[PDB]
Amino acid sequence: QTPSDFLKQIIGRPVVVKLNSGVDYRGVLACLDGYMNIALEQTEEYVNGQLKNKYGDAFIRGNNVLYISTQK
Amino acid sequence: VEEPLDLIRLSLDERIYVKMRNDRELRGRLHAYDQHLNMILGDVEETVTTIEIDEETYEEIYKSTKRNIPMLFVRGDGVVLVAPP
Amino acid sequence: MLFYSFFKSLVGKDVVVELKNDLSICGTLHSVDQYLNIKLTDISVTDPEKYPHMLSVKNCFIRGSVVRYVQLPADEVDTQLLQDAARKEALQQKQ
Amino acid sequence: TSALENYINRTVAVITSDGRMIVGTLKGFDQTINLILDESHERVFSSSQGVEQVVLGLYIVRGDNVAVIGEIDEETDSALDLGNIRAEPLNSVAH
Amino acid sequence: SILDLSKYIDKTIRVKFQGGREASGILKGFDPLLNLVLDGTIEYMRDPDDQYKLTEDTRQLGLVVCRGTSVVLICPQ
Amino acid sequence: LPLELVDKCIGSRIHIVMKSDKEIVGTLLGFDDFVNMVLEDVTEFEITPEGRRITKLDQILLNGNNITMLVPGGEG
Amino acid sequence: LPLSLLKTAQNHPMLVELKNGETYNGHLVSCDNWMNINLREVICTSRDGDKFWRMPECYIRGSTIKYLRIPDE
Numbered sequence: 169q170t171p172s173d174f175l176k177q178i179i180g181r182p183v184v185v186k187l188n189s190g191v192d193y194r195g196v197l198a199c200l201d202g203y204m205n206i207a208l209e210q211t212e213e214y215v216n217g218q219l220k221n222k223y224g225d226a227f228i229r230g231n232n233v234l235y236i237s238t239q240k
Numbered sequence: 241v242e243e244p245l246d247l248i249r250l251s252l253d254e255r256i257y258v259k260m261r262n263d264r265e266l267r268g269r270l271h272a273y274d275q276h277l278n279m280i281l282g283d284v285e286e287t288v289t290t291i292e293i294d295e296e297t298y299e300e301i302y303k304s305t306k307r308n309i310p311m312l313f314v315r316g317d318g319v320v321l322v323a324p325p
Numbered sequence: 326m327l328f329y330s331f332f333k334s335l336v337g338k339d340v341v342v343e344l345k346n347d348l349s350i351c352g353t354l355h356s357v358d359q360y361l362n363i364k365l366t367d368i369s370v371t372d373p374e375k376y377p378h379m380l381s382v383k384n385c386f387i388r389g390s391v392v393r394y395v396q397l398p399a400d401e402v403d404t405q406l407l408q409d410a411a412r413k414e415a416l417q418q419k420q
Numbered sequence: 421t422s423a424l425e426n427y428i429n430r431t432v433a434v435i436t437s438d439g440r441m442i443v444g445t446l447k448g449f450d451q452t453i454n455l456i457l458d459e460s461h462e463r464v465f466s467s468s469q470g471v472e473q474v475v476l477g478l479y480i481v482r483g484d485n486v487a488v489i490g491e492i493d494e495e496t497d498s499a500l501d502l503g504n505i506r507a508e509p510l511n512s513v514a515h
Numbered sequence: 516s517i518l519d520l521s522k523y524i525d526k527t528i529r530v531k532f533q534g535g536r537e538a539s540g541i542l543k544g545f546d547p548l549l550n551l552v553l554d555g556t557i558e559y560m561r562d563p564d565d566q567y568k569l570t571e572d573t574r575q576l577g578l579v580v581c582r583g584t585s586v587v588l589i590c591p592q
Numbered sequence: 593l594p595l596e597l598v599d600k601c602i603g604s605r606i607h608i609v610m611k612s613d614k615e616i617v618g619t620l621l622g623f624d625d626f627v628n629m630v631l632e633d634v635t636e637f638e639i640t641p642e643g644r645r646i647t648k649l650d651q652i653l654l655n656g657n658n659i660t661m662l663v664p665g666g667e668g
Numbered sequence: 669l670p671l672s673l674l675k676t677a678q679n680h681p682m683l684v685e686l687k688n689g690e691t692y693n694g695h696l697v698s699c700d701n702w703m704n705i706n707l708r709e710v711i712c713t714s715r716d717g718d719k720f721w722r723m724p725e726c727y728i729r730g731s732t733i734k735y736l737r738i739p740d741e
Contacts, residue, residue, distance in 0.1 A: 344487070344488075344513070345487075345512075345513035345514070345515060346435070346439060346487065346510055346511045346512065346513055347511055348510070355422070356421060356422035357422055358421065358422045362422055362453075363422070364422040368490075375507065375508065376507070376510065377502075377504050377507055378433070378435070378441050378463065378504065378507070378510065379433065379490055380501070380502050381492045381493055381500070381501045381502055382433055382490035382491060382492050383491065383493065384426075384490070384491045385488060385489065385490040385491065386422065386424055386427065386488070386489045386490075386491075387487075387488055388453055388483075388486055388487055388488065390513075391437065391487040391488065391513050
């Protein structure tokens, strides 16, 4: 229950999503699900500097997601 | 609650950009996918990115090759991310 | 279900399976199961036979987990079915 | 249906996910592709030392590590074709 | 199922884990899923240079839970 | 019982060590059945490089897939 | 058939190569339906032949098994 309530009150916030491969994605959390699949709008991608800036929604696999965090 | 899968099925019939494991990307028209992120893409272009290193200086030169195909099934375990081009 | 039913429609079609090991195999689709394991009849190694490790092999079972890509022709697929079935399926898995 | 039924007690070529070919005889399998095999030997070293080629008879391969099983056209027990050693060694399923 | 951990319930055990980690500690409790409670926990890592020299790569962690999902082997110490 | 220990660590500092040389120290807010953990104001360390990678603020959901060890009270 | 062979293989010598390239040499005392093992009288070895430790019982998670070499019997 603590995670499902977390899920509800991070919709619309800016977040950092880090994958298992160590890639970091930053942007506005458009959606998430119970399996930790993510869509983010305005997503930057980091590893060794700036690697991608994204102009539409990006969808991320929950099986490959290591963490999701609010950005402040 | 639109799930990420519900919002990615809004991009059906459209051209998408898929970044895959092994320094590879695909661009193609999204005909189908499931919850595992298995995907059927039509009119696709695969790009394979590799690092060539100068033997003497250790300086890296980025090189690429490309493959194109009419219709292609992609296993979902190779997919890292989906976006548009 | 979706891709299991999709590969059941392509039995008896000529397809190319490219693996995670970079090996590419031409062959005729004979059967598929619930994990999307493929059995291919009358196989030949495509790209080059630089992978000669088979040669004397005419039919292979492929574990579904080692597939990277399955290349198909455009003539084999109804794209309307695939988009309609996909919209119905993502709606089914999560509800 | 795609079962490994047709390949029972016949010569087979197995590719493990490490990138290792095996010649063997498939005695048994289950529904996770856990392979029970006999009379196993490699393929990359038979041209150097044919005695060292024979690893064993009798081993359990776990289905998680199996990539590929291929059916080979054995005349009768005690015979198979081909050998190789100057090929770009095959890779693993990990990338 | 197969291993009753009640025979190991209070002694130092050696546990290898999936990511390459080795941990050693006194078993204080467990569940059917093989989650463990260990006391006096030492964690060891493995590098290419640390093989028989496994002692320099040592961290102390005190009381821990080891997740039963990544447990790869368990034996006495 | 291990899950009872993790329940006892709600609202305490905890250190979460992954399979890799990576670990996460923060206050444990709660967890689910699969041990996906919600952590608040989290410090992310890589052990191998000898340095923190980020100071997180707010809450993180840290997936239980790669979680090897849970240390109540944190480091030392 | 395979897990059935392991159930009847209770008491045999066995060599177990794991995912991590470590070798276990012991005598099988029990298996389950998920292929986890316990084994009696055990040698731990790296792939390169380094013997690190010796034990009387050991439990091996079935997911970490690469393969099991049984006797020719």
